Amino acid sequence: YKAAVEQLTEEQKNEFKAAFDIFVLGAEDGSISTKELGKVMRMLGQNPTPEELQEMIDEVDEDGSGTVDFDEFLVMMVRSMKKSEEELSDLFRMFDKNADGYIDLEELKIMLQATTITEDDIEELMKDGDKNNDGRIDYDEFLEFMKGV
Numbered sequence: 001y002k003a004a005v006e007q008l009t010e011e012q013k014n015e016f017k018a019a020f021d022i023f024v025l026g027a028e029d030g031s032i033s034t035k036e037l038g039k040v041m042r043m044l045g046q047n048p049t050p051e052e053l054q055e056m057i058d059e060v061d062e063d064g065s066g067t068v069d070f071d072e073f074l075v076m077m078v079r080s081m082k083k084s085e086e087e088l089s090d091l092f093r094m095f096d097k098n099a100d101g102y103i104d105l106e107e108l109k110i111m112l113q114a115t116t117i118t119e120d121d122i123e124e125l126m127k128d129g130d131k132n133n134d135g136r137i138d139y140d141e142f143l144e145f146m147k148g149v
Ligand SMILES: CC(C)COC[C@H](CN(Cc1ccccc1)c1ccccc1)N1CCCC1
Pocket: 041, 046, 047, 048, 049, 052, 053, 086, 087, 088, 090, 091, 093, 094
């Protein structure tokens, strides 16, 4: 909910902002349309249909603008943290190409293709998610990372 968004620390909002920035790369009016959602999806190795992408945009577009702005992105995230389990597993697998149950530094570099976010940002992301210091994020770490401890 809108209010719950204000429970996020200032650092969480910034991190979500960094993620939002990747989606709006080269976007009109800096908001996420089906076009940008399709580009990230494709960069992650998927091949969504127009119906699937439109379904995702409508699910989080609260003002019927047809696009997702940062405020709506935040609410969307707050909502998933506080079905979500399944999307999380798929997302993990999108990064875990060899299916060994880990996301290593190289696999995270997928986010630099056709791209705002930098290698330093990636190595930092890795440190944030890698709790046991083995240079990788396993599924349990990933879930804790995505849900918030
Ligand atoms: C590498 C694969 C294991 C991940 O793809 C799984 C897809 C993702 N979904 C939704 C989704 C998108 C983003 C993040 C998590 C889930 C999907 C839907 C439309 C287009 C591409 C993927 N789900 C489709 C139904 C069950 C599998």
